[PDB]
Amino acid sequence: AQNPNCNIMIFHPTKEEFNDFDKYIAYMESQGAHRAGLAKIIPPKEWKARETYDNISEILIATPLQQVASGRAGVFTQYHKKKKAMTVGEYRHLANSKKYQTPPHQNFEDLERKYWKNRIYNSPIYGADISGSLFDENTKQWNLGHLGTIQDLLEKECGVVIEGVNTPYLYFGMWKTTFAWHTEDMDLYSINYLHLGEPKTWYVVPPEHGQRLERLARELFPGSSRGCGAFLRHKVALISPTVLKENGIPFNRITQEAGEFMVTFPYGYHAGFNHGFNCAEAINFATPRWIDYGKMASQCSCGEARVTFSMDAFVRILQPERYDLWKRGQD
Numbered sequence: 198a199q200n201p202n203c204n205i206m207i208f209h210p211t212k213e214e215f216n217d218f219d220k221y222i223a224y225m226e227s228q229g230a231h232r233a234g235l236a237k238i239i240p241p242k243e244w245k246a247r248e249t250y251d252n253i254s255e256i257l258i259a260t261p262l263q264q265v266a267s268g269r270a271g272v273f274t275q276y277h278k279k280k281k282a283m284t285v286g287e288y289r290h291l292a293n294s295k296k297y298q299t300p301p302h303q304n305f306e307d308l309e310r311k312y313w314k315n316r317i318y319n320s321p322i323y324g325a326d327i328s329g330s331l332f333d334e335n336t337k338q339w340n341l342g343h344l345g346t347i348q349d350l351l352e353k354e355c356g357v358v359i360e361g362v363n364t365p366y367l368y369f370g371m372w373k374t375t376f377a378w379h380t381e382d383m384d385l386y387s388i389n390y391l392h393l394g395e396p397k398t399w400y401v402v403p404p405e406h407g408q409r410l411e412r413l414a415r416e417l418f419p420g421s422s423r424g425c426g427a428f429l430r431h432k433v434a435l436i437s438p439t440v441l442k443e444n445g446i447p448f449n450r451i452t453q454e455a456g457e458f459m460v461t462f463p464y465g466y467h468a469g470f471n472h473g474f475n476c477a478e479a480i481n482f483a484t485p486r487w488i489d490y491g492k493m494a495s496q497c498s499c500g501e502a503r504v505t506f507s508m509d510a511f512v513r514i515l516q517p518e519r520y521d522l523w524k525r526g527q528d
């Protein structure tokens with residue numbers, strides 16, 4: 198069995214290997230990349246996402262989210278407080294202000310220490326989940342707005358035609374902005390490209406060990422767990438690497454830099470934080486290997502998780518027994 202210790206693998210495809218996205222995902226899995234839950238893909242030196250980032254300041258962040266924490270430094274939840282709209286230019290200025298800018302630090306490890314020590318005492322503002330793309334239409338390779346859709350994959354594998362569309366999302370980040378522990382909707386893959394700016398640190402649990410994370414989370418967030426049997430779908434809970442080590446949960450960590458792709462694999466729990474002002478783009482996708490994960494994915498039916506239009510058909514076709522309860526949670 199390839200990659201039996203579930204280490205995060207890093208790939209350096211040639212320009213030729215960068216042509217066929219599906220084939221390269223399948224190649225990565227042949228080498229055991231999916232066992233980690235997360236892989237890094239460094240694009241060939243010939244490739245570019247677009248010509249420059251000089252003209253992005255007028256993009257609107259309609260609902261910036263202030264991420265307010267509660268709990269202790271290693272074990273906390275966050276809620277999202279809606280702020281007034283601002284442009285990417287206004288946001289970048291705010292990120293770089295004394296109140297929100299990255300502190301002086303020696304290296305990524307020092308910054309990680311500072312994040313886990315001090316995150317709870319600040320409430321950074323995140324521009325998340327903005328529908329859109331920064332890939333040039335003329336970028337033909339690994340263009341996140343031109344991937345095959347999850348609806349077409351399900352149709353190709355299973356023969357059922359379904360409604361729904363699948364488009365990318367932009368994330369504008371600042372120091373301490375945080376993504377809580379989660380797997381993707383319906384345990385899909387995700388792909389994330391860091392277009393510009395400061396890094397993003399990721400933590401990941403191997404898919405084969407996801408249930409160990411869930412058990413710990415139920416222990417650490419006992420009221421949340423009573424409220425919903427899939428409360429990690431709410432995307433609000435954080436657990437530090439120190440706490441995971443203390444409880445024997447297998448995980449790995451890696452820092453993504455501008456110009457790099459990360460791929461999360463089905464049922465790979467991940468979490469992380471941004472180092473400073475940045476812009477990422479991400480989208481879900483599927484492969485044939487996903488179908489079995491989709492069929493077994495947990496669902497939140499308590500009402501909190503509320504998700505896209507397009508998840509309806511996935512639940513309806515893959516999880517017909519669950520569909521009625523899940524939809525009640527939607528309404």
Ligand SMILES: O=C(O)CNC(=O)C(=O)O
Nearest residue numbers: 368376387388389477479
């Ligand atoms: O970049 C972020 O804030 C969150 N991204 C993801 O969880 C992802 O790409 O799967």
Ligand SMILES: [Mg+2]
Nearest residue numbers: 253254255256
């Ligand atoms: Mg603009």
Ligand code: NI
Nearest residue numbers: 380381387461
């Ligand atoms: Ni994700």
Ligand SMILES: [Zn+2]
Nearest residue numbers: 425497499501
């Ligand atoms: Zn729930």
